[PDB]
Amino acid sequence: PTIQQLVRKGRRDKIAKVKTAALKGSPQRRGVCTRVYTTTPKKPNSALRKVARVKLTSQVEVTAYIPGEGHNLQEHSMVLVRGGRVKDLPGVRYKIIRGSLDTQGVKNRKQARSRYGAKKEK
């Protein structure tokens, strides 16, 4: 535009959408697992993804994905959720950390253990 049009109005930058709004500026956030269930992915994929409806201390109800081979999560479980988006399930934007609070590390795991909360067997 004209330099006078720029003087009168100026440049207003675009707005930056908030990412992971339920964490409220925190890396991790604790919650109680209100429900555990399984759901089916989109068109070209086929599995039983393990998800959990949890209630964070932000007083926000969210869905989190449970990674690994297996888990022992039921209702009323202290879980620690963190960021992370899996493309396969459109609704989920959070993942439950394996190896903290009531969430156990996967069993018989011996590669990339840290990301799955497994101790180094001696």
Sign of CA dihedral 51, 52, 53, 56: negative
Q: Which does 115 bind (CB under 5 to 8 A by kind): RNA, other proteins, none?
A: RNA
Q: Is 4 in the site for other proteins (CB under 8 A)?
A: yes
Backbone φ and ψ for 5, nearest 5 degrees, come out as -65, -30
- Burial call 3-16: b when 16+ CB within 10 Å, e when fewer: eeeeeeeeeeeeee
Q: Which does 122 bind (CB under 5 to 8 A by kind): other proteins, RNA, none?
A: none
Q: Is 72 in the site for other proteins (CB under 8 A)?
A: no
Q: Which does 104 bind (CB under 5 to 8 A by kind): RNA, other proteins, none?
A: none
Q: Using CB under 8 A, which of the segments 1-9, 19-27, 60-68, 113-121 binds other proteins?
A: 1-9
Q: 61 vs 8, 78, 94, CA distance in Å?
A: 45, 14, 11
Q: Which residue from 32, 35, 86, 105 is in contact with RNA, where contact means CB under 7 A?
A: 86
Q: Is 61 in the site for RNA (CB under 7 A)?
A: no
Q: Which residue has the tokens 């934007």?
A: 93
Q: Which residue from 30, 35, 55, 115 is in contact with RNA, where contact means CB under 7 A?
A: 115
